[PDB]
């Protein structure tokens, strides 16, 4: 055997039933600057098999308690072993009990420990927040266990599975309010041993995990709202932010949310109240601790008078996201963390569903195509991608479970289920759901419960019939990675899959147990009517009618894009949807006019069509008014203006967007009155603040009055903003650029004076927008200046600069000059040398910068690149990929853009 405190998951020997923990923060530093915590524990646990050890989790705890580490006792009248010896192995985090004999299947013991550890600003545990207000640094203690962080805190089975209910204490200094998962029992009593700390007892948790407790000390006020089943709802922040009146949207939008998903769920919120709190740079950015949600500050808070549209639909999803959790994923658990991508891909998903019931004008389910789908398909389109599944025996380590949060486990993770939820009907998907939930709440559970709750709905009706089990079907889209291309030919109505990658050239290592092949549920419009549906079944090949098109007809796949895949057609079907697009684009679903334009330039890349087919589908956009096809344009054309923006390309491609977004520029000239008033509706919003973006940094000339007239007026009456904040990173960039000193010093004492993060990292951003070299220069002189412009900022500034054409050589010589700086800032505070090397390389696309950069990267002798190490060999393989790229397309989109641009 091996030792199990050697192994990495807990023993199964013992359960845990009931933890008592109290914790007292000393948010007053000892004076050699250390802040700590105080903790005593008791766990009460059951014997499910005689062993002579007790294994539970521990973190850079120190133990005080007397005697050994632990006190063990029996409950009710077990007798309970001596212990031999208690000792600490940091490996795998363990706290070990040796003891002279076994505990006793069906027996329960309570162990109790007396500990401490640091409270450090390090937001792993239980941890210390600070921050500014006015002259004061003020300090606060605060949580983050997710995901294997509670043993930080104190000792416990530290696993997702082994939940138990929760009775937390928090002593604490007597003018602070204590907050915990659950309400206090009462009011707060005094410390006997010293009243200027006072103790709150909060009530009994549901039985719950580990990684979803938090306890919070400090000075933050509410405002609050009682739903009217009694269930209290809070939002808590900052004292200054609250009576500014910061907290009042994520209020007006939670009790509306926690209605939708108590109906959608069919599921009373299973708690008392629910607290939602704001702090300050909590990097995390939100965390669904059961009854005290976390948030950063930008993610919970509004201000109406300086924030963006884009800002209030960051709030109302971020809520939606985390409040989803409080049913799925922390009434009913996934057993390990190798299920992450369910978890976190159901909310994901169903974030828009809970904020489109609070926001129902605004087509907010419409976002997850942009906002996931797509996101997610440019790095599942590569042989280095992976499955969303993972065997729970390959994820053991901290470092291991951490790796399960990324894009794939999230954004495809939400793709899949949306696709899932569509095939079935939203009805079908919401009554197995149900069930689901009901069976397994307060429970743990794999993917294959909720597979199996499903096929039981889909067998107890007879109207929605499937090529195969539910279980079948998802293991095509969960055990294998990407995705595929559907191609059909509309001349016969053949219609093929392969595995999709962007890299036609890439060896695909990662074998598949089903040979990259799909069961796909298929989707299609003709003429503009809905066809009956279709499933390709798990083969290469097949055909069928309803792809087979007459000569003035089409056919277009894959409505809205619920199916995770990209379509191709022959040329032929591909006009005759440009020809719709031009006559009447109203026949084609928003989502779909976008669609064509995602997947052309997708297909081009991978060389299924030809680049000017790509190109060929924008032409409709000069009289598009919707958001999302200008969206799927800018986000594909951004690389080509990333790689011709200094060349002779440039001014053709200019040209020829200042053609397509001229009409939509004047349309909400006039929609909007002069500019006076903002359209109604969100999509309408994003529409507009995409067009003046467009026009503005493409020159056109009426989009440049607009903003020179705007930050003249700004200018002259400096206490009162015209630009509304839609319009503001635009119309502030635009008037740097064409400005000089004048304007640049006037943003730059406003940037100075700003007291919002929104409205400093915009002014930040457009101050880069100058064209004056010596400008540029003198302000990458102060991004190393903490005085002017924090550490924090520091490279993102860098980077802004280097966007800018006329700071590209700037910022590149900045940092390769100053690069001896790794030795003062992988000192002092971390930095992301990597993030500033892509941002600031991201151009390079010839044979002479490809030498620049390995002549950079010969200064290895010493220094090296720290976090940035992996990220400049990313450089070096991106301009090679770079360099093909512009061989292979430059003459072709010369001559493409010269052509259509009048
Ligand atoms: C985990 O925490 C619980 C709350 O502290 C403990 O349960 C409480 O035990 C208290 C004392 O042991 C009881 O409070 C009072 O204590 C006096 C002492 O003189 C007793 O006479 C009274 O029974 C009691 N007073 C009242 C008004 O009840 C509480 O009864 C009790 N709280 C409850 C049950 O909610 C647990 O013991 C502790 N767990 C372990 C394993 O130590
Ligand atoms: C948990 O226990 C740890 C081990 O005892 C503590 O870490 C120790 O802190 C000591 C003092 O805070 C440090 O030792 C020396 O301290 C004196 C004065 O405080 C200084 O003169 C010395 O410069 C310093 N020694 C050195 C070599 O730097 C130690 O840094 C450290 N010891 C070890 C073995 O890590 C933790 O502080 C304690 N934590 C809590 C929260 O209680
Ligand atoms: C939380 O919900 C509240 C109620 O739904 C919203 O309160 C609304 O705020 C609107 C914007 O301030 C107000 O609209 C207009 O305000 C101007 C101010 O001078 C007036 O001219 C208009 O008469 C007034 N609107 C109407 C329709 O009369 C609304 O007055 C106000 N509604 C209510 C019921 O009080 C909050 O905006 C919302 N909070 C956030 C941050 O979104
Ligand atoms: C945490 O507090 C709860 C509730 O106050 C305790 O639950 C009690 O458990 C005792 C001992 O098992 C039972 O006799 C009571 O019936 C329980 N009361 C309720 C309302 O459930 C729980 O034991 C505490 N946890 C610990 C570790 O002490
Ligand atoms: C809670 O009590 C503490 C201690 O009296 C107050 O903290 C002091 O606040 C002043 C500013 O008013 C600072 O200059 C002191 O340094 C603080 N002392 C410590 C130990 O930090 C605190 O302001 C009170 N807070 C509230 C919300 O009432
Ligand atoms: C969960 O959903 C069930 C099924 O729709 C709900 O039960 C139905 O409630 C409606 C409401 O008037 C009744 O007309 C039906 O007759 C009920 N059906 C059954 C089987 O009881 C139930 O109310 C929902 N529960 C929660 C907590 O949302
Ligand atoms: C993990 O969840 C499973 C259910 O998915 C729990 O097993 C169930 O336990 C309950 C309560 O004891 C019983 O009603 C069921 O018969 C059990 N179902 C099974 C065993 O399949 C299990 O207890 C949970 N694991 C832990 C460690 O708590
Ligand atoms: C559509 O699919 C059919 C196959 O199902 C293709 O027709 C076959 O082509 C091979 C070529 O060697 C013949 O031997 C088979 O007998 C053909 N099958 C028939 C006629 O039923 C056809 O090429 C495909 N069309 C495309 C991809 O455009
Ligand atoms: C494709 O997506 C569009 C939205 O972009 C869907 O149209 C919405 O349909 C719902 C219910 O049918 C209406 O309540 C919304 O107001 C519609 N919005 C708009 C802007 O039309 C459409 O239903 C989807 N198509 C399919 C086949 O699922
Ligand atoms: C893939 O393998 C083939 C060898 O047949 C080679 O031509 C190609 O360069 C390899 N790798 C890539 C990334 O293209
Ligand atoms: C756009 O197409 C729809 C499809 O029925 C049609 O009703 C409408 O008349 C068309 N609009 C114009 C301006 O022709
Ligand atoms: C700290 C936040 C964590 C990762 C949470 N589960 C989220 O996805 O936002
Ligand atoms: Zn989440």
Redesign the pocket.
């Given at each position: 055997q091996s030792k199990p405190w050697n192994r990495y998951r807990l023993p199964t020997t013992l359960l845990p039933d009931s933890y008592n923990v109290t914790l007292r923060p000393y948010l007053t530093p000892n004076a050699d600057g250390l802040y700590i915590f105080k903790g005593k524990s008791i766990v009460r646990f059951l014997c499910q098999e005689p062993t002579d050890v007790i294994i539970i989790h521990s973190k850079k705890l120190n133990y005080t308690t007397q005697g050994h580490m632990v006190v063990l006792r029996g409950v009710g009248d077990s007798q309970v072993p001596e212990i031999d010896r208690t000792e600490l192995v940091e490996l795998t985090e363990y706290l070990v009990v040796h003891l002279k004999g076994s505990l006793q299947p069906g027996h329960m013991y309570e162990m109790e420990s007396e500990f401490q550890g640091e409270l450090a600003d390090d937001l792993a545990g239980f941890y210390r927040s600070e921050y500014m207000e006015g002259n004061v640094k003020k300090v606060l203690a605060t949580t983050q266990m997710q995901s294997t962080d509670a043993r930080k805190s104190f000792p416990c089975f530290d696993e997702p599975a082994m939940k138990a209910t929760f009775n937390i204490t928090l002593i604490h200094p007597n003018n602070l309010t204590a907050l915990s998962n659950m309400p206090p029992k009462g009011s707060s009593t005094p410390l006997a041993e010293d009243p200027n700390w006072s103790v709150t007892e909060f009530e009994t948790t549901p039985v719950m995990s580990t990684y979803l407790l938090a306890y919070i000390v400090s000075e933050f006020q509410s405002v609050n709202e009682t739903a009217q089943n009694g269930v209290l709802i809070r939002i808590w922040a900052r004292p200054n932010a609250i009576a500014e009146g910061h907290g009042m949207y994520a209020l007006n939008v939670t009790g509306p949310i926690l209605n939708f998903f108590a109906n959608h769920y069919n599921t009373s919120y299973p708690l008392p109240k629910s607290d939602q709190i704001a702090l300050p740079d909590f990097n995390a950015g939100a965390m669904e601790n059961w009854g005290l949600v976390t948030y950063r500050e930008n993610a919970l808070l509004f201000d109406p008078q300086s924030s963006s549209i884009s800002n209030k639909e960051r709030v109302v999803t971020v809520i939606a996201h985390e409040l989803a959790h409080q049913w799925f994923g922390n009434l009913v658990t996934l057993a390990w963390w190798n299920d992450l991508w369910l978890n976190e891909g159901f909310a994901s998903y169903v974030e828009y569903l809970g904020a489109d019931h609070a926001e129902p004008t605004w087509n907010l389910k419409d976002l997850i195509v942009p906002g996931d789908v797509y996101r997610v398909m440019a790095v599942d389109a590569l042989a280095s991608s992976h499955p969303l599944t993972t065997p729970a025996e390959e994820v053991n380590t901290p470092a291991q479970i951490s790796e399960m949060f990324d894009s794939i486990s999230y954004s495809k993770g939400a793709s899949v289920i949306r696709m899932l939820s569509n095939f079935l009907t939203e009805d079908l998907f919401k009554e197995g759901l149900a069930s689901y939930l009901h069976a397994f709440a307060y429970q743990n559970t794999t993917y294959l419960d909720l597979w199996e709750h499903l096929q039981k709905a889909v067998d107890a009706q007879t109207s929605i019939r499937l090529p195969d089990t539910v279980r079948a079907i998802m293991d095509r889209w969960t055990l294998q990675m990407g995705f595929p291309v559907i191609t059909v030919?509309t001349?016969?109505g053949?219609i093929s899959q392969k595995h999709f990658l962007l890299d036609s050239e890439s060896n695909v290592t990662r074998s598949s147990a089903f040979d990259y092949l799909w069961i796909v549920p298929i989707s299609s419009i003709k003429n503009g009517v809905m066809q009956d549906h279709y499933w390709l079944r798990d083969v290469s090949?097949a055909?069928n009618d309803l792809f087979k098109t007459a000569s003035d007809d089409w056919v277009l796949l894959n409505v809205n894009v619920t199916g995770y895949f990209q379509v191709n057609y022959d040329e032929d079907n591909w006009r005759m949807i440009q020809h719709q697009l031009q006559t009447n684009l109203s026949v084609i679903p928003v989502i779909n006019r976008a669609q064509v334009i995602y997947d052309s330039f997708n297909l081009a890349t991978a060389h299924m069509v030809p680049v000017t087919l790509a190109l060929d589908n924008t032409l409709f956009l000069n009289g598009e008014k919707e958001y999302m096809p200008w969206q799927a344009a800018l986000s594909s054309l951004s690389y080509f203006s990333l790689m011709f923006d200094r060349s002779e390309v440039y001014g053709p491609m200019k040209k020829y967007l200042r053609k397509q977004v001229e009409p939509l520029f004047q349309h909400f000239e006039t929609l909007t009155k002069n500019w006076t008033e903002r359209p109604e509706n969100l999509m309408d919003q994003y529409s507009e603040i995409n067009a003046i973006s467009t026009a503005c940094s493409n020159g056109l000339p009426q989009c440049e009055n607009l903003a020179k007239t705007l930050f003249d007026q700004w200018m002259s009456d400096p206490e009162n903003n015209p630009i509304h904040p839609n319009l503001r990173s635009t119309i502030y960039c635009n008037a740097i650029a064409q400005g000089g000193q004048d304007q640049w010093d006037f943003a730059w004492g406003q940037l100075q004076q700003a007291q919002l993060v929104n409205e400093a990292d915009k002014l930040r951003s457009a101050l880069a927008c100058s064209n004056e070299v010596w400008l540029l220069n003198r302000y990458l002189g102060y991004t190393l200046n903490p005085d002017l412009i924090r550490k924090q900022d520091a490279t993102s500034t860098i980077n802004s600069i280097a966007s800018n054409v006329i700071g590209q050589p700037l910022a590149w010589d900045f940092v390769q000059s100053n690069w001896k700086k790794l030795f003062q800032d992988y000192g002092g505070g971390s930095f992301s040398f990597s993030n500033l090397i892509q941002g600031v390389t991201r151009r390079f696309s010839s044979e002479f910068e490809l030498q620049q950069l390995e002549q950079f990267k010969k200064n290895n002798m010493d220094v090296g690149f720290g976090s940035g190490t992996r990220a400049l060999e990313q450089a070096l393989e991106k301009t090679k990929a770079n360099i093909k790229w512009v061989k292979e397309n430059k003459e072709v989109v010369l001559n493409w853009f010269i052509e259509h641009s009048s």
């Open positions: 030919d001349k016969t053949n090949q055909q």
